[PDB]
């Protein structure tokens, strides 16, 4: 064939830390359907937001918003336990259906996005150019967020350790840990990836007893 319908830009959702995660790649032929399982970012999270985005940038905020919906009633459980299956389906007339379903509870929610939604031809071409012009920065951003997300998990894992051990932990070891937690928490708010890893390392080096 010499012609066909494609979706012109990547389609996906916002994930923890303000990143766009792609479910359907740019220039995929339509109709098409793809699903991927996601989980909760923190312990005891009972509601998630599915924010639908179009574009090629790694910062969710730099892409085009197509709509959003919440899924709630998820049983509060450890981070990573819920299995939320997100499905993007674009039909032959370009209509996008997005659904999310929590596998444990069976709770599901969905939105329908009309074909005319999203960026026009001029904006598409500018999106592709701007993604390319910023590819190194967007990559650094994605690397930064994965480190912040590891760091924030380390902060929460470790805080639950301090409690769990409680009295068993020597006053000296608790104080050094608290103060390494504070430094990491500060580093996490910055945008220097090595600085965060260095503070995670400093924390590991006063946590041997807690470990």
């Amino acid at each position: 064939v010499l012609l066909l319908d494609v979706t012109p830009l990547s389609l996906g959702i916002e994930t923890m830390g303000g990143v766009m995660t792609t479910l359907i790649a740019k220039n995929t032929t339509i109709p098409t359907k793809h699903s991927q399982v996601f989980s909760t970012a923190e312990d005891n999270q009972s509601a998630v937001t599915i924010h639908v985005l179009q574009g090629e940038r790694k910062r969710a905020a730099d892409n085009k918003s197509l709509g959003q919906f919440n899924l709630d009633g998820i049983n509060p459980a450890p981070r990573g336990m819920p299995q939320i299956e997100v499905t993007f389906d674009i039909d032959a007339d370009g209509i996008l259906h997005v659904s999310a379903k929590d596998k444990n509870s069976g709770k599901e929610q969905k939105i329908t996005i009309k074909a005319s939604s999203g960026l026009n031809e001029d904006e598409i071409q500018k999106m592709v150019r701007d993604a390319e012009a910023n590819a190194e920065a967007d990559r650094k951003f994605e690397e930064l967020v994965q480190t912040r997300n590891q760091g924030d998990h380390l902060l929460h894992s470790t805080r639950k350790q301090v409690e769990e051990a409680g009295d068993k932990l020597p006053a000296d070891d608790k104080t050094a840990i608290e103060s390494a937690l504070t430094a990491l928490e500060t580093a996490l708010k910055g945008e220097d990836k090595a600085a965060i890893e260095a503070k995670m390392q400093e924390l590991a080096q006063v946590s041997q007893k807690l470990m």
């Binding site: 994930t15 923890m16 991927q36 989980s39 909760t40 999270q45 998630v48 937001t49």
Partner: peptide, 6 residues
């Protein structure tokens, strides 16, 4: 991957 936090 993880969904945004609460």
């Amino acid at each position: 991957s993880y969904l945004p936090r609460p």
